[PDB]
Amino acid sequence: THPIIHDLENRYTSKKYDPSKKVSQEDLAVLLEALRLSASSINSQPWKFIVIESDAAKQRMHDSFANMHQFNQPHIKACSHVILFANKLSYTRDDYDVVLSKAVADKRITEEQKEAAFASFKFVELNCDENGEHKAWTKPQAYLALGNALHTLARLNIDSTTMEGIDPELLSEIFADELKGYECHVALAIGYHHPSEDYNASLPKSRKAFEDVITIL
Amino acid sequence: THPIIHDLENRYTSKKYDPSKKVSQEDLAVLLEALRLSASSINSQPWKFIVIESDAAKQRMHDSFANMHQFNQPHIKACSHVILFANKLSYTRDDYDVVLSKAVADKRITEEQKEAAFASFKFVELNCDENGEHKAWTKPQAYLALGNALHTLARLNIDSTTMEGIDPELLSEIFADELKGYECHVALAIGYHHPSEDYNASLPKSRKAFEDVITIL
Ligand SMILES: Cc1cc2nc3c(=O)[nH]c(=O)nc-3n(C[C@H](O)[C@H](O)[C@H](O)COP(=O)(O)O)c2cc1C
Ligand SMILES: Cc1cc2nc3c(=O)[nH]c(=O)nc-3n(C[C@H](O)[C@H](O)[C@H](O)COP(=O)(O)O)c2cc1C
Ligand SMILES: O=C(O)/C=C/c1ccccc1O
Ligand SMILES: O=C(O)/C=C/c1ccccc1O
């Protein structure tokens, strides 16, 4: 099988973890760097990735399921790490300035092309909320990073569970300082599936027929 | 360098294509199948991928830049193919029926459980607009597929240009029947970069410091 297809056919949504297997620090660093290298509109990188690693953090994450979506709760303590994909509520020129400043330092642009580069910012101004939030534009960038992460995990042979069945308001209450100026609509548990009880590990994958999703003109 | 990091460090946004080089049909098939295998909430696959391949299609795509974002226009005819990432305006039971029916054909689920698998649908109405639309929930799924596509292209060593600088209104008029019931906010040109005029091919990549985007708890 072609290496790419094999990876994408063999990755799946784990439904039960093995609590005695953890992701190595070597593999965790590759995944975090892969997330950092993700592409985004105007290189805005309107995101933050919060890694829930310690037992104390796992407890706090475990507690965010007190009100809803408890079918996802068992995974928190059983899995290796949980990653929260946070997107910024509003993106300002000061936020973009952090990007352009780093670009000047990295030698992509000099101050000359810089002030001119600040113009790329109009593409942000164009996208917003009636109230003033760019979150309708930043959330999709975070999902792109997530798509990148899932492909990365398939290459590292690490199991995972994407979770939209989380409590955003409670997460912002529990991770108050960390999610300041951000929101979190999706999380990702990673680890190693349970050898016997993960029932999804042996169910065939199912997608719509090629002709139903792809059109060639 | 670690294979995964090498791929993500070496992929970039092409700013000029070589008109004489096309993507082979063998590579195109791997990419399309990779897009089809993308994960989505409840396996909804609320998307459609439109491949602009023919000269006639390229002309139509070229014409959608008549009003805005003409900086992206030159790539249309110069690159190999353009892929439109379309997300469904509203998601219904009839839509889910298609997924569930294919699941039974794939043998993932037995005919008897189709009806009980519809239970996962409550998560969709939980994202129903006042207008009865779900596009705020479907658009992010499309971006996940896009993140998957970018990683896939880095593995195949094919150049690309993600484009949000497109005209969704004009695209809907030009690809009237193809985008019916969908919207398109992002497109992706693929091909081979121009050996001498693609200025971005030799500029270093720049991302925020690890500590600015990743927090470990
Ligand atoms: C954005 C998103 C959110 C999802 N949320 C959940 C979740 O809350 N819990 C879980 O069990 N599965 C979740 N999944 C898993 C999907 O059911 C799964 O990706 C889809 O069925 C395709 O199967 P595979 O992932 O096994 O290919 C979600 C997937 C996506 C991409
Ligand atoms: C969602 C999205 C839309 C983008 N739109 C454009 C676009 O319209 N035109 C273009 O030249 N670049 C576009 N880009 C490219 C970004 O500028 C680029 O991905 C970012 O600067 C990071 O650089 P790399 O892609 O070279 O790593 C877009 C990127 C993303 C992910
Ligand atoms: O990333 C860039 O160079 C342009 C991005 C962009 C342009 C126009 C409209 C929307 C965009 O994300
Ligand atoms: O994909 C699944 O099995 C559940 C997805 C989900 C659940 C609750 C809320 C939002 C969701 O996408």
From Swiss-Prot, chains A, B:
<comment type="similarity">
    <text>Belongs to the nitroreductase family.</text>
</comment>
<keyword id="KW-0274">FAD</keyword>
<keyword id="KW-0455">Luminescence</keyword>
<dbReference type="Pfam" id="PF00881">
    <property type="entry name" value="Nitroreductase"/>
</dbReference>
<protein>
    <recommendedName>
        <fullName>Major NAD(P)H-flavin oxidoreductase</fullName>
        <ecNumber>1.6.99.-</ecNumber>
    </recommendedName>
</protein>
<dbReference type="InterPro" id="IPR000415">
    <property type="entry name" value="Nitroreductase-like"/>
</dbReference>
<dbReference type="GO" id="GO:0008218">
    <property type="term" value="P:bioluminescence"/>
</dbReference>
<keyword id="KW-0285">Flavoprotein</keyword>
<dbReference type="GO" id="GO:0016491">
    <property type="term" value="F:oxidoreductase activity"/>
</dbReference>
<keyword id="KW-0521">NADP</keyword>
<keyword id="KW-0560">Oxidoreductase</keyword>
<keyword id="KW-0288">FMN</keyword>
<feature type="binding site">
    <location>
        <begin position="164"/>
        <end position="165"/>
    </location>
    <ligand>
        <name>FMN</name>
    </ligand>
</feature>
<comment type="function">
    <text>Involved in bioluminescence. It is a good supplier of reduced flavin mononucleotide (FMNH2) to the bioluminescence reaction. Major FMN reductase. It is capable of using both NADH and NADPH as electron donors. As electron acceptor, FMN is the most effective, FAD is considerably effective, and riboflavin is the least effective.</text>
</comment>
<comment type="subunit">
    <text>Homodimer.</text>
</comment>
<feature type="binding site">
    <location>
        <begin position="11"/>
        <end position="15"/>
    </location>
    <ligand>
        <name>FMN</name>
    </ligand>
</feature>
<dbReference type="InterPro" id="IPR033878">
    <property type="entry name" value="NfsB-like"/>
</dbReference>
<feature type="binding site">
    <location>
        <begin position="153"/>
        <end position="158"/>
    </location>
    <ligand>
        <name>NAD(+)</name>
    </ligand>
</feature>
<feature type="binding site">
    <location>
        <position position="72"/>
    </location>
    <ligand>
        <name>FMN</name>
    </ligand>
</feature>
<dbReference type="InterPro" id="IPR029479">
    <property type="entry name" value="Nitroreductase"/>
</dbReference>
<feature type="binding site">
    <location>
        <begin position="205"/>
        <end position="207"/>
    </location>
    <ligand>
        <name>FMN</name>
    </ligand>
</feature>
<keyword id="KW-0520">NAD</keyword>
